[PDB]
């Protein structure tokens, strides 16, 4: 679908309504598969960190590390398609100008590529931006082929604030996700038993960001 249509008939209304929006088959197999390869190349070439220190005790030969990350600008060699994904996310947001709440998005962060190694680690329940640092919208692109949460875990569980239930989103291949970055969406990544990749980009609201250093 053309971005503007995807944005106007789906993204905008879903976001203002639920604060969470899922888009399957965002770029298609050929482009989605290439992004997967570039991401996997960065991993195999050691561009990723060693992983978040989960269990830090006494004999550090058995320290347990979880999610590994690397910041991508999109212009790095061997990251062209990743750069293409970022431009595609930008166009959608751009088309949502002045319709996502009363926000006015003027910029974004670099892409944060994450790899949960599959050693049973996940990510504790958290709020992406709990202290008004400017990030209003979180955007995640998943690239995991035939991911079966029933055996591999790695579900993204979001607990919408004005709700008793929670939303379970599987890190499926070619899936694009949007959700308010603040207190409205506390979320967590359930333990992953298989290598799990995702690419995150946060969009900034001009006003929240502008006063971030003086509020």
């Amino acid at each position: 679908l053309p971005a503007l249509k995807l944005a106007l008939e789906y993204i905008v209304p879903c976001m203002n309504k639920h604060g969470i929006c899922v888009v399957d088959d965002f770029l298609g197999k050929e482009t989605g598969q290439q992004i997967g390869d570039e991401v996997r190349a960065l991993h195999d070439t050691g561009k990723f960190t060693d992983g978040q220190l989960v269990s830090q005790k006494s004999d550090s030969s058995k320290d347990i590390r979880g999610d590994k990350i690397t910041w991508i600008e999109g212009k790095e060699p061997g990251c062209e398609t990743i750069g293409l994904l970022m431009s595609s996310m930008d166009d959608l947001i751009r088309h949502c100008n002045g319709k996502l709440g009363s926000y006015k998005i003027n910029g974004r962060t670099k892409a944060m590529v994450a790899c949960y190694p599959g050693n049973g680690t996940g990510y504790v329940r958290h709020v992406d931006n709990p202290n008004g640092d400017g990030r209003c919208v979180t955007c995640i692109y998943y690239l995991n082929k035939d991911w079966d949460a029933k055996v591999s875990g790695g579900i993204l569980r979001i607990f919408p604030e004005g709700k008793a239930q929670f939303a379970d989103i599987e890190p499926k291949f070619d899936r694009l996700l949007f959700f308010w970055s603040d207190r409205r969406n506390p979320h967590e990544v359930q333990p992953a038993y298989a290598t799990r990749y995702a690419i995150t980009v946060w969009y900034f609201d001009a006003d929240e960001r502008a006063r971030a250093k003086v509020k």
Binding site: E73, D90, I93, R94, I105, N106, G107, R108, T109, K110, D133, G134, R135, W202, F204, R209, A212, K213
Partner: peptide, 7 residues
């Protein structure tokens, strides 16, 4: 803080 890119 986080680096900001103009889209």
């Amino acid at each position: 803080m986080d680096d900001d890119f103009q889209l």
